Write a structure and sequence with these properties.
Structural class of chain B: mainly beta
Radius of gyration of chain A: 24 Å
Chain A: CAP256-VRC26.01 heavy chain
CATH topology of the largest domain in chain A: Immunoglobulin-like
PDB class: immune system
Oligomer: heterodimer
Keywords: HIV-1, V1V2, CAP256, VRC26, immune system
Order of helices and strands of chain A: EEEEEEEEEEEEEEEEEEE
Helix content of chain B: under 10%
Assembly: dimeric
CATH topology of the largest domain in chain B: Immunoglobulin-like
Number of strands of chain B: 18
Order of helices and strands of chain B: EEHEEEEEEEEHEEEEEEHEE
Strand content of chain B: 35-45%
Entry title: Crystal structure of human Fab CAP256-VRC26.01, a potent V1V2-directed HIV-1 neutralizing antibody
Strand content of chain A: over 45%
CATH architecture of the largest domain in chain A: Sandwich
Chain lengths: ~230, ~220
């Protein structure tokens, strides 16, 4: 069967270069255009680069012009993406993809460029950050000052500016699990991650029960316990 | 450069859904439209190309069409494995750059009751402000289908810069949650009368507002 496999991804500092490779098998490689497409977590699909069967005709997505170069070696069934002058914003999963091609106006026309990809790889991840390992700063998300009677109240902690992933969070050392949700992280333009954790609790408990979020960041050997209390106003 | 899609479409198992893709004559009008499915931990998959052609192996419950400035993907016989994100795409060869993809649509195969989100908007903590930073945190929970749109306002004006929003994540009760952040300077925070988080879900928008001058 037709297959495509990327490699070369990793964590790299801004300014530096990285070369991704894609090897194809199971079809006549020289009869099809190939391309690279990327997707950053929480964002959409973005065209990176495209190259004709013979390697002569190339094009690039606007965000990468003059920094990335695509090439292929038809004797080795390989496509390359040379990435220069990397930015935090180039952080993404990078897919190698095969153009669907088309016939001669049934025989295969190697000059075809359809721009529709009928075979994609699983992708290789590229993360761009200037950061060294760094433990988080934890800030409280205090319950509403209007939750003074009954009902329920959301409270949380904002876990900011750590690297690399992951952080895990518990509440009251694991005593509190119902109504707890810890969100996926966001990569900031700084190249550091942030996330939030929230718990919903009875409003009547806010004056009597202590709530502490316990943050664990093993990469930096850091744990933080942050008491989240009602606001004074 | 923008192919617009609805953020969410849904139906019960066995029913049919359609997903629209809207653009202009420069893109959709003149060029072929393709459609893709993607699902985390899988390679994306081509469903339709050249407006309405199925590549080998794609069954006929998938269809495509195009008229004027909008194109459409149809999926009949909806089944659980169809829950994924769908993207249209086209390539305008009359410009030097590459192709474009649409804004994306989550298709949900309805398996539980619809649930409207609870929205909680946290102003910057005094602690964070003392650290010379300011993050508004909009936490959105207990909704289904698991797709929302989030927009921010400063006073009455839309804000685009400084916004980050996470993809909805399954909760332990099997509903979904999402988070959105608006990063400001302490000056910006104190400079406005209010800020609002607006969350749109299935025909409802819920807006929460906070103010530097009030105890939320």
């Amino acid at each position: 069967e037709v297959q495509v496999v990327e490699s070369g991804g990793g964590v790299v500092q801004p300014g530096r270069s990285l070369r991704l490779s894609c090897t194809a098998s199971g079809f006549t490689f020289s009869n099809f255009a190939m391309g690279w497409v990327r997707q950053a977590p929480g964002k959409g699909l973005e065209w990176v680069a495209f190259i004709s069967s013979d390697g002569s005709n190339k094009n690039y997505g606007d965000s990468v012009k003059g920094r990335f170069t695509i090439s292929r070696d038809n004797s080795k069934n390989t496509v390359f993406l040379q990435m220069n002058s990397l930015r935090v914003e180039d952080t993404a999963l990078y897919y190698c993809a095969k153009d669907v091609g088309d016939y001669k106006s049934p025989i295969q026309d190697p000059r075809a460029m359809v721009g529709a990809f009928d075979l994609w790889g699983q992708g290789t991840m590229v993360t761009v950050s200037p950061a060294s390992t760094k433990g988080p700063s934890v800030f409280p998300l205090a319950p509403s000052s209007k939750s003074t009677s009954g009902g329920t109240a959301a409270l949380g902690c904002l876990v900011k500016d750590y690297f690399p992933e992951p952080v895990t969070v518990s509440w009251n050392s694991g005593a509190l699990t119902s109504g707890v949700h810890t969100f996926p992280a966001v990569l900031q333009s700084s190249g550091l991650y942030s996330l939030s954790s929230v718990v919903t609790v009875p409003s009547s408990s806010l004056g009597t029960q202590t709530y502490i979020c316990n943050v664990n960041h093993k990469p930096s050997n850091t744990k933080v316990d942050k008491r989240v209390e009602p606001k004074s106003c | 450069s923008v192919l617009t899609q609805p953020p969410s479409v849904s139906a019960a198992p066995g029913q049919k859904v359609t997903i629209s893709c809207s653009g202009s004559s420069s893109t959709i009008g003149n060029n072929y439209v393709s459609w893709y499915r993607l699902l985390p931990g899988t390679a994306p998959k081509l469903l339709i190309y050249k407006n309405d052609n199925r590549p080998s192996g794609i069954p006929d419950r998938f269809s495509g069409s195009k008229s004027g400035t909008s194109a459409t993907l149809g999926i009949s016989g909806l089944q659980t494995g169809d829950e994924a994100d769908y993207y249209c795409g086209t390539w305008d060869t009359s410009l030097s750059g590459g192709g474009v993809f649409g804004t994306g649509t989550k298709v949900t195969v309805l398996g539980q009751p619809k649930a409207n989100p609870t929205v909680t908007l946290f102003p910057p903590s005094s602690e964070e402000l003392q650290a010379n930073k300011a993050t508004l945190v909009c936490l959105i929970s207990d909704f289904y289908p698991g797709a929302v749109t989030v927009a921010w306002k400063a006073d009455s004006s839309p804000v685009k810069a400084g916004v980050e929003t996470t993809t909805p994540s399954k909760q332990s009760n099997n509903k979904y949650a999402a988070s959105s952040y608006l990063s400001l300077t302490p000056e910006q925070w104190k400079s406005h009368r209010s800020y609002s988080c607006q969350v749109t879900h299935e025909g409802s928008t819920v807006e929460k507002t906070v103010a530097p001058t009030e105890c939320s």
